[PDB]
Design a protein around this ligand. Structure first.
Ligand code: YQU
Ligand code: ZN
Length: 353
């Protein structure tokens, strides 16, 4: 039961120094790219966005896979929703500025910005032989010494009120309080470019709303009680359940690598499902450390439901379905449904030693 799960968590602790070292490699490469981008007139305002809950500038999204976000302070943004998608928007500037070279009419071109961003980085990773860095295809994906991959996301920062599509999102009122929800909604939001001809290209220059910076505000301040996990009397298992969900997905993706059925699923999906379960189970007494196995089952059952019903709401944008057929094909969701069901009904053989 829970003892198999606690053993998994104890084993995860053994790779803490591998992780810390890789995160240091990433940090060096990114600092170097940061000062070069700052030379460019378009990217003079670039900086690192703190999104990690463990390491500040670097978020780990899988073993030796790391995520980094470069933000661009961008004033006076005017948004126009693209074809009722709730998450994708055209970016204009309320009535010159450094980004003027990327305009196509009033509209800021995602693909032109991405193109110069990529070009500057690809040119720059050529030029330090202290580490070996190439570029794969997240604006850019790097590979460091053929082992550690870094996804680098460029994002516009907007200090305006959040778009109306988020009005019913971040549904934390009954768990973390309406006061906290108000404070978090005073923070900036971010727009990440979607190339006009990439993916199944819209043929438009649209940007997706991004709230990845909110994760650390909540994951490390996660209780109904303000002192949850700050003393020995208030120990919950929220963080451990999330770790186990991520590890479940990681291990399944590894086992199904022969035909890569699970390529489209990521830790973002797991995290989104996990925080929906936090909304559903707002009391700290529902996450008692002694109940690790039941709490994990709660999390897996909800993820399974999302898979079977092909529905996983964006935590911030309820009308945006992360599991829509536009984003993940039906056979992928049907396939993972079957595997998650098997693991849950058989006490997670994927965690066996
Ligand atoms: C309580 C809470 C707080 C934050 C998050 C959160 C948000 C985002 C986001 O909206 O950017 C995340 C993320 C985690 N992990 C990865 N991304 C990035 C997604 C993304 C964005 C744009 C294009 C493609 C993909 C969650 Cl689920 C819950
Ligand atoms: Zn806690």
């Amino acid at each position: 039961g829970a003892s198999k799960l606690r053993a998994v968590l104890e084993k995860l602790k053994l790779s803490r120094d591998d992780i810390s070292t890789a995160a240091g490699m990433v940090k060096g490469v990114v600092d170097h790219l940061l000062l070069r981008l700052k030379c460019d007139s378009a990217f003079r305002g670039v900086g690192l966005l703190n999104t990690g809950s463990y390491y500040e500038h670097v978020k780990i999204s899988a073993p030796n896979e790391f995520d980094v976000m470069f933000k661009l302070e961008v004033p006076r943004i005017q948004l126009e929703e693209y074809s009722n998608t709730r998450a994708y928007y055209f970016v204009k500037f309320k009535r010159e500025n450094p980004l003027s070279q990327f305009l196509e009419g009033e509209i800021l071109s995602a693909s032109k910005m991405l193109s110069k961003f990529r070009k500057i980085i690809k040119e720059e990773i050529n030029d330090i032989k202290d580490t070996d860095v190439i570029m794969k295809r997240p604006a850019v994906t790097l590979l460091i010494s053929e082992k550690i991959s870094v996804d680098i996301t460029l994002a516009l920062e907007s200090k305006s009120s959040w778009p109306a599509s988020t009005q019913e999102g971040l549904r934390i009122q009954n768990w973390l309080s309406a006061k906290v929800r108000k404070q978090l909604r005073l923070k900036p939001f971010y727009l990440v470019p979607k190339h006009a001809k990439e993916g199944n290209g819209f043929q438009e220059e649209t940007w997706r709303l991004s709230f990845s910076h909110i994760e650390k505000e909540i994951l490390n301040n996660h209780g109904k009680s303000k002192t949850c996990c700050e003393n020995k009397e208030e120990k919950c298992c929220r963080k451990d359940c999330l770790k186990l969900m991520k590890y479940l997905l990681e291990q399944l993706k590894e086992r199904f690598k022969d035909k890569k059925h699970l390529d489209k699923f990521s830790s973002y999906h797991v995290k989104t499902a996990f925080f929906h379960v936090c909304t559903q189970n707002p009391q700290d007494s529902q996450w008692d450390r002694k109940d690790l196995g039941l709490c994990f089952d709660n999390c897996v059952t909800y993820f399974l439901q999302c898979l079977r019903t092909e529905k996983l709401e964006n935590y911030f944008i309820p009308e945006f379905n992360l599991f829509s057929s536009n984003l993940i094909d039906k056979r992928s969701k049907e396939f993972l449904t079957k595997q998650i069901e098997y693991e849950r009904n058989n006490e997670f053989p994927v965690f066996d030693e």
